[PDB]
Design a protein around this ligand. Structure first.
Ligand SMILES: Nc1ncnc2c1ncn2[C@@H]1O[C@H](COP(=O)(O)OP(=O)(O)CP(=O)(O)O)[C@@H](O)[C@H]1O
Ligand SMILES: Nc1ncnc2c1ncn2[C@@H]1O[C@H](COP(=O)(O)OP(=O)(O)CP(=O)(O)O)[C@@H](O)[C@H]1O
Ligand SMILES: *[C@H](O)c1c(CO)cnc(C)c1O
Ligand SMILES: Cc1ncc(CO)c(C=O)c1O
Lengths: 268, 269
């Protein structure tokens, strides 16, 4: 069985905890062949840590996509896309590929970006992985505060064409346990682990969606892939570490090097 | 203890076998925290595999470097640099950092002002310099090298130009029954050998080699132990390389941890 080829269409996080860096590291950890088409470069100021986003030109974006498409990805993830034009093209390359899996991490103002996502990505998404704020934006419900709110959003997001939806609650929701809500159109599943240290969590969302993608490419069902991704990212969070006064990234290699973490799944 | 922070200063190999892709993968495999400052983006034509190098703006290269230096690398590798400006800046950020280790992979293929720039700015700061047979000929001024004796000569010259340790890769380019690399520490030459493995799918082997050397140094191996371990690491990767298309196929970066170790024969020559 040859390595599964997994493409991420994503920006570079120079601090190397999130972004295409989280993606390639997680793809490597999960025994897939990681590839990236880069969309922008994010840098941070040495004194204040203020972020700056440098876009890449569309000409180089297209050249990267031609190369990736000729290689033929088995699975595609999207992360930071940044423009409507990019969001659009991302969906197209999935369709143009022979990929069977598309994981849209809807990283988020111009609500135009959000409408593009709804319009071009959701209908193609094998799984869409919003955080609590992003699920409120995609659903139109605004602030979500509870599992029941998460159910409503997931329902709206499924109706918008995503075949499977995972709304991450985590630290944004409850503080005692870490709750996410998975929906496949017929059943709501609550996914749960212990709530680990909250200080050093940079890169968890990116790592969750990259894992989901790898687990899918390697033949897990969308439901089993999201359960496995949460266990994978949970270890990474538990083993997060302090980079400097501003940031502490998850340890993407922790699941394999340090420990597994249990995930409890219940129908809600 | 904490994960070692390892920075590569390198281009993106869209095909993902070499470049910063091989570096981050290798770094991940070797239990370090991998980081990149991007210098350029390399793409390939879908029908011919002809490469195209799109430079990144110096303004973004410098901002990436500020971020990385602020984080504080333990070890820095250089890959595709592309210009004398970036070459110079790569050496300058190493000295500004508290990194103990600088591994310069003098990439010239997959502007020989660059060669001279590497010689002036990078060799004197290098813990280890890792040229392939072709790059060793360029850096030494000897031209084409075809033997262990020519490699020793190149190694001495490169060492005299300031590189603290030198490994000249022979491998398939030496065109012998086994894969020989030559290590020199200014005192003694060591020949490193593994079998020759399949030749068709080796893309990324050089970048991988130098990445593993970097991560091994960061994790506390001596320069000689680090390049010996790197050869064993990339040997497995090469042995388990696979066919990407009719043009190229990459090494399997994860083969050393996932598939097999390959013993490296070490002889003082
Ligand atoms: N401290 C913690 N303990 C356990 N699980 C956590 C956690 N923090 C977040 N999670 C979980 O991590 C995954 C990612 O969550 P989410 O996307 O909300 O985090 P995030 O936005 O803070 C990280 P990123 O820096 O890439 O954006 C989800 O599975 C969520 O349950
Ligand atoms: N077919 C093969 N079998 C065994 N060892 C090989 C090999 N090809 C290269 N090597 C070894 O791999 C390491 C990398 O060698 P070198 O830098 O010359 O690779 P390369 O130029 O062939 C790949 P790239 O340029 O695409 O990154 C060296 O240790 C060399 O001995
Ligand atoms: C070429 O494949 C290559 C190398 C060494 O071959 C190094 N870096 C990058 C970006 C490449 O594309
Ligand atoms: C490149 C890139 N992509 C995604 C994210 C957020 O998950 C970040 C930072 O949080 C980033 O820098």
């Amino acid at each position: 069985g040859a390595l599964k080829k997994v493409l991420t269409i994503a920006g570079s996080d120079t601090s190397a905890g999130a972004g295409m860096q989280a993606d390639l590291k997680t793809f490597q950890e999960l025994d897939t062949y990681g590839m990236v088409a880069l969309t922008a470069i994010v840098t941070m100021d040495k004194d204040t840590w203020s972020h700056d986003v440098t876009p890449l030109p569309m000409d180089v974006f297209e050249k990267q996509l031609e190369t990736a498409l000729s290689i033929g990805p088995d699975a595609i993830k999207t992360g930071m896309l940044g423009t409507e034009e990019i969001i659009k093209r991302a969906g197209e390359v999935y369709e143009a590929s022979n990929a069977q899996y598309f994981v849209v991490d809807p990283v988020m103002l111009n609500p135009g970006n959000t409408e593009a996502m709804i319009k071009y990505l959701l209908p193609k998404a094998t799984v869409v992985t919003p955080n609590l704020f992003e699920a409120g934006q995609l659903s139109g419900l605004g602030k979500l505060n509870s599992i029941e709110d998460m159910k409503k959003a997931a329902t709206i997001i499924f109706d918008k064409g995503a075949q499977h939806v995972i709304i991450k609650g985590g630290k944004a929701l409850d503080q005692d346990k870490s709750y996410d809500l998975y929906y496949d159109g017929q059943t709501f599943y609550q996914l749960t682990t212990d709530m680990f240290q909250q200080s050093y969590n940079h890169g968890a969302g990116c790592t969750f969606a990259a894992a989901t993608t790898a687990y899918l490419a390697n033949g897990k069902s969308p439901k089993e892939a999201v359960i496995s991704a949460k266990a994978f990212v949970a270890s990474a969070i538990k083993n997060g570490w302090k980079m400097n006064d501003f940031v502490g990234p998850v340890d993407h290699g922790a699941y394999n090097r340090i420990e597994h973490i249990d995930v409890e799944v219940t129908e809600v």
